[model samples]
Target chain A: YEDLELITIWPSPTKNKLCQFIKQNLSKEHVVTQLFFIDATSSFPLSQFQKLVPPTLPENVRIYENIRINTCLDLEELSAITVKLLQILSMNKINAQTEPLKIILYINGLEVMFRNSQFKSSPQRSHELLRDTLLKLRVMGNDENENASIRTLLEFPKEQLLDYYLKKNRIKNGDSLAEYIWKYYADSLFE
Target chain B: NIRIYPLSNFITSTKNYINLPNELRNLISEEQESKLGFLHIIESDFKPSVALQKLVNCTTGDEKILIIDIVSIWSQQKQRQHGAIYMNSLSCINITGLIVFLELLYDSPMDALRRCQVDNFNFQLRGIVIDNLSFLNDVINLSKFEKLFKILRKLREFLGCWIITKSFPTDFYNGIENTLVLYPTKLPDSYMKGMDLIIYREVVDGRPQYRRIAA
Candidate 1:
C-alpha cells in the first residue's frame, strides 16, 4: 500500500474538492481520524472547510477537534518541519490509546516554495530540499507503528514550477516533471 | 446624511464592544453609527474592488486608504495587470493612497507590512483593504497571524483606521469581530458565528440578486 500520494496541477478547483474529501472522512462517527492540511501557499479553501462539522453535533465536540491546517512559508526549513510532525504523530499515538489513528498529512503548495525569491537563485536546491523531506516521510510511513498509521499526500501546483523544472531537470528520456518526481519521490500519483 | 451599511444594525446593537467616546458617539448618532473595531471582514473573491466599494460607501472625504493585494490565484503578469487597473480606479476616485502587491508565494506578510510602513511614512493612514487576508496563513508560521492581527489592531486603535480584508468560511479567528460575509449562497445558522453581517449573492434563473442579512 503506497502511503505517499502525489498531486500535480495548476491551482484548480480540484484542490478544494480534496479538502471536502478530508472533511467527509473526519466527519464520520465510526472512524477517529486526524487530518493535517499544511498549505504551501495562502490559498486553502476556507469555503469548504467551514462545513467540516455538522450542526447536529454539539459545539464543544465539533469535527475540527481532530483537524489542523498549517502554512509553511520558510522554504529552507521545510524538511525540519516534517521531522517535528513525525514527533507529533508519535506523541498523539502514545497519549491516546483509542481506535487505530487515521493520520492524513496533506502538504500542498511545494511549488509555491519553489517560486520564493530566496530560491530564485537555485530551484534545484529547493527541489532537493523537498525531495529529502519526502524521503524522510517515506521512511516514517515504512516504520512499524502498529497503533497508528499515516497516509501522506503532497500537492505541487503545476503553475510555472512544472514547466521550469521539466526544462531544468530535463529527464533526458522525455519524462514529464510529474513523472520525474513520481519516479523517485512519490509512491503513488493522485491524478 | 447618515450612511447605513449591512454592518450598521450590528454596530447599533453592540455599543458595549465598541467603546467610542460620548462626544464621538454623539457625532455618529446626531448623524448615526458603525463596526467597532477597524476590522472589516468580507467574504468574496480576490477582488479589492468589492472591499473598496464598501470603503467608498462607508467613508467620506480625503481619508488615505491602503490597498494590500495578497492574492496568489493569478499569474504574476495577471496580478500586475489587475493591480494597475486598481491603481487607475483609485486615482479616479481622488483617493490619496498606496497599493502594495505582495507575492505571498515569495514574500511574507510581515515583510509586506514592514515595507508598507516605510512606504507610508509620510502619509496619514486611515483605512486598509486586503484582497485576501486568510492566505497569509500559508506564508510563514502560525505566529504571523498573532503578529499581523496585533499590527492591524494597533493600526486600528492608534491611527483610527478601518481595515477591510477577505475571509472564507473555514477560516479561524481570535477576537476579530464585525465580519461582513458576501456569500454566494445561504449558510446554515450553525455555520454562522462571529459574522456581523451576511450578504447572499443568489442567482435566480440567471438574474443576479442580493439579500442582506444582519447576523
Candidate 2:
C-alpha cells in the first residue's frame, strides 16, 4: 500500500466539498491514509500553514486549494496559505512535473464570481499577488534548499498555458483569458 | 509750514522744549494729536534715528513733501504687488522719483529695478543714484527702473481713469527701447535650439501628443 498524501482544507464547507470530490474520483484506486481538515474560521494562525507533511507519507501525493469560504474572513489568510504551500513544495523538491503531486487552486464561489467581471480585472494586481506568494515561498524554502520549485513554476514557458486556454475556449484574436476571468468576477468582487 | 529738526540736532539740543510761531506750533500739535482714548510709547534699540537723520539732511521742505509723496506711492505699489510695504529708507521715495532716476540710465524702470535687485556689478551704482532722486520731473522720467516704472504707470493710469479726470504720461514704448540696449537683444541659444528641435520632431511627426511627450 502506498503512503497516503496528506490533504488539508480550510473553512469547513470547502473542506467537505474537497473531501467529497476526492472520494468520488480517486478513492477506488488510491488508498487514502489521512484527511486533515483545518478550520480557518477561528484563530488558525498563518504560521501553521508551512508545517511539513508527516515523514511517513507515500511518494504519490496531491494538495488542493486551502480556500476560505467565509465572506467575513480576511483574504490575506488565503494568500498566506498559498505562500506556505509553495514553501513546502519547494523544500520537498516537488516541482510541477513531480508525478502524482498536483496542486489545484480553487477560488471560493464568491471570489470566482468576483473575478469574473471586467471592472475588477487587473493584471498588475494578479502579478503582484503571484510575485508576493513566490517571494514568501523563496524565503521559507531557504532553510534546506533553494526555491527550485518556485523557479520552475515562474520560469515555466507561459506560451503553452496561453495556447491551451485560447484553443480550449475557441477564442478569437482579441479575447483575453485575463479579461474573461476579470469580467466573470466583476459583480461579486467589484460591485 | 513746519519747522524741520534733524534727528541728531534734536537729540543733542540742551533744552527739551522750544517755542514756535503760534500757527506752526498749532499745526504740529494737531498733526501729533492723540485721537483716541489712550497713547503709549515703547522704547526700542532698533529705532530709525540714523535714517531719520539722513532724511532730514537730504530733504528741503518741498523735497520733504516729495519724499512723503514718494513714500506714499511706494507703500501703495508694494501693497498692490506684494500686499505689504516695508518701512525702509529706499521705499520712502515717491514712485515718480524712483522711476525718473532709473529711466535716466536705462529705458524702463522695471529693467532698472531688476538690475539693482540682482547682483549685477554694472547696475549697482545706477540703482543707488535712482534711489536718491528728489525732483518730480526727474523721478517721473525714471524709465530705467522698468519694474517700478511699469507698476507706477499702471497705478497712474488707474487713478487717472477712476479718481482723476486727466490722463497721465506712460513711456512703455520708450522704456522697451532702453531695455533692449541694456539687456541682450536675443533669447538664449539653448532655448532657441530646444524649441527648434521640438518643432522638428514632435510637431512634424504624426505621433499622438501623449506618445510624443510620454517617457
Candidate 3:
C-alpha cells in the first residue's frame, strides 16, 4: 500500500498499479487469474464465452480473460447488451498521447472486476476471444517494463510472451487459447 | 456521401452494433471509403477467366488498382494466358487464392483519410471479387464458409463496395451482422437461393424471364 500513488494518473501508471497489485495479493492458492471488463460505455458488446481453464496447472496457476461480442440478440437488445460485454489496455509517453477514457485496475480491483465465477463458453469461441483481447492489451506489453508488469499482472512467470501475439501459436489444430497463454506464462503446464 | 446498411432483421440484428450508425454504415463508408472498385462472384456454371476477363476488358483506371481473380474457387483461373493489366488505381492480381487474399487485405488496413495510397499500408482496399465463392458447398464445410463469411464482413467494414455472387445457402448470410443482399432475380422460392428475390434478366415473348432456376 505504501508504493501506491495517485500521481495524477501519470505515465507508467498501469505498470506500477498492476505490479503492486500482484506483489501484494496474488499467490499459489489464488491460482486462477481472470480479468473481465465492466464496460460503462455499453458501446462494448458481448460475443459470449465459456469458462475453460486451458491447462492442467500445478494446482496453482490458471488465467482467463473477458472475450466476445453479443451476436444472437435482436438489434435493440444487442445494443442494450454490449455495455454488458466489453474491451481494453494501457500505453505510455505514447501514454500521455494516451487514448483518453480507459480503465486500468490495481490488484485489488481485479476481484471486483471479475466478480462472477460462472463464466462459460465453447472452446473455439473462448480461445478466439481471449486471443483478440490479448492483442488489444498489447500496448500493456509494448516494452520491457510494461511487458514485465503485464506478466506480473497475469502472474505469468515468463520473461516474455513467446511472440508478438504468439505468431507461431496459431489457434487451430486443437490449440486452445489457454495453451497459447501458457506457452509463455507457464511452460511446465505443457509437460 | 455515406450510406446506411441494414443487414439486420430483428430490432436487434447485428447492424445495430456497427461502430457509427449514420453515414459510416454505407457499403463504403466515408471513413472506410476507396475509389469504386469492382468484384466478381461467378456462378458455378460461370467461367472464371471469361467473367474476370470481361470485367478487365471493360475496366478503366490507374496503374495501382488491382483486379484480382481469386484462384481458390477456380484453380484454373491461373491457367489463363491473359496477364495482369493496370487500370489506373484499378489493377489486377494474377489470380490469387481466397483465404490468402483476404488475409492480405486484413493485414493491409487502409486509412480512408490518407487519400487511398499504397504507402499508407493502413488504408482500406477498394474491394475483392470472390468468384464462385458461394460454390464452396461440398468443397468446404459450413463452418469454413461461416468462417469466411465472418472475415469478408470485416473486410467490408474497412472499405467500400464489395459484392458476393452465389446460389449460396441463404442462411449463411446471417453469420455476419450488417450490409445488403443483392440478387438479380425476383423469382419465387423454388427458383431463388434461400428466400432471396430473383428478377428478370431477359424478356420472353411479352413476358420477363427470371434468371435460371435455383435447382
Candidate 4:
C-alpha cells in the first residue's frame, strides 16, 4: 500500500527532499493531517523538520498543529505505541466530521533500536517482532475506509539496510543484491 | 516381516489434490526423480502438504513412502484429509528393514533424534521427510543444527534416499538445489537470491493461483 513507505536514507541530498515532501503534505487543504514522529534512537532532526512548516494559515484550516512525538528504546514500547496509533485511527473512523483524518507517522532509526542492548539476547527474533509490527501498520494503512487514512514513513540508514538484508538472507551475491534493493525498495535512489 | 503398501492405498481419501507447480517439478534431476527428491514447502496458506501428498502419491509405485514429520502437522486427520493420506502407527521395535518415520509433536528435535537412534534398526530407510527444519535450532541454546544436518546428509548418502523438510525463512541452510519459496507477500531481493525457485500467490480470475517469479 502507498500508505507505508520504507525510506532508506544514505548520505545524499534526498534528506532535504524528504523534508520538502513532508512540507507539501502539511500544506494540503480541507483535510485534518496529524503528524506522528516516532524517535527510536533519540536523534530525530527536529530542527530540520521544524523549518519545513507551511506559511501561516487560517485557524479554520489546520496544519501541523496536531503533531505527536514519541521516544522509545525497546520493541515492547514500540508495539504499545503502534497499538495506540491503531486505536487512534479506529476512533478517527467513527468520530469523523467533514474533513477526513490523515495520520503521517514518521518512524526514525528502527534499525538502531533493533540492535539496542535490550534485544541482544535474540536479535533475529527481535527483528522479526519489528517486522511484524511494520506489517500490522501496513495492513492498517491499506484499509479502504476513506474517513481515516494512515501513512507511515519508516527511515533506515542505507548501510544498516544492506547489512540487515544481507544477514537476514545469508546472501553470497552482494553487488547485485544491493543494486536491486536500491533500485526498487525506495523511491529516492538519488535526489 | 516388514511390509510396504502402495502410497495411494495408505491415503485416507481424496478431497482434491492441488498439484505442485510444473516449474518446481522440472528442477528435480532425472536420477533423483523416483525416490530421491526432497521437496521443501516454504510457506503457503492453502494446505501445502496436499501438494506434497500429490507428489508422493504419483511417484510411489506399490512402495510405502516414509514421512518423518517434525511438527506433526501431517499427523492430524483433518489436515491429512486435506492431503487425503492415512498413516498407521506401530511400536518402534516392530519396524526393522522397513522405512521409519520420525514424527515430532510438540517436542524437541534432539529428543526425537535420541528416540530414533534408540530404535537401532540395522536396516536403511526408504526416505526421510522432516515436516520442518525450524525446531532443530533456536536462539536460546547452543544450536544442534550442525549435527542434525550431518546425520541427515549421511543418512541420505548411505541409504541413497530422498528427504523433505519444511521451513519458513530462506535464510536457513539447506543442500537442496531447488529451493521453492511459496508465499503471498513479497520478499526482499536478498531473500530471493539464495532460493533456486520462487513461487508467489496471486489472485487471477477471482481464484488464488501459485505463479513463478523470474530471477
Worst 10 residues of 4 chain B by lDDT: B90-99
Off by over 4 Å in 1: A1-16, A29-31, A51-61, A93-97, A117-124, A157-179, B1-215
Docking class of 3: incorrect
lDDT (Cα, 0-100) at A134 in candidate 3: 35
Alpha-carbon error at B71 in model 2, in Å? Answer: 76
Order the numbered candidates by TM-score, best leading: 4, 1, 3, 2
RMSD of each: 23.1, 32.6, 21.0, 15.2
Stretches > 4 Å off in candidate 3 = A1-191, B1-60, B63-97, B109-125, B138-140, B166-215
DockQ of each: 0.02, 0.00, 0.01, 0.02
Error of 3 at B54 (Å): 5.4
The residue ranges of model 2 lying beyond 4 angstroms of the native Cα positions read A1-20, A26-72, A94-99, A109-127, A130-191, B1-215
- What is the lDDT of every predicted structure here? 0.45, 0.26, 0.29, 0.47
Q: Per-residue lDDT tens digits of candidate 4, residues A1-191?
A: 23333233332235567667666676667787777878775665556765565334454234456767788776677888988988998888888758888888776655456556234645445534554465456446545578987766665555534544453454533222223223222323321
- The lDDT-based order of candidates, best leading, equals 4, 1, 3, 2
- Evaluate model 3: give its lDDT: 0.29
**Of the candidates shown, which would achieve the greatest lDDT relative to the real structure?**
4
lDDT of 1 by residue, B1-215 (tens): 99867975654531212223332233233322345343333343323333334443332333345555333221122233211212212111111122223232023434444543334333344555554443332233334444455555555554555555455333222111111113332222322333334333333554534344454
TM-score of each: 0.38, 0.20, 0.25, 0.46
Flag regions of model 4 displaced more than 4 Å.
A1-15, A54-61, A117-125, A163-191, B1-14, B27-40, B43-167, B170-215
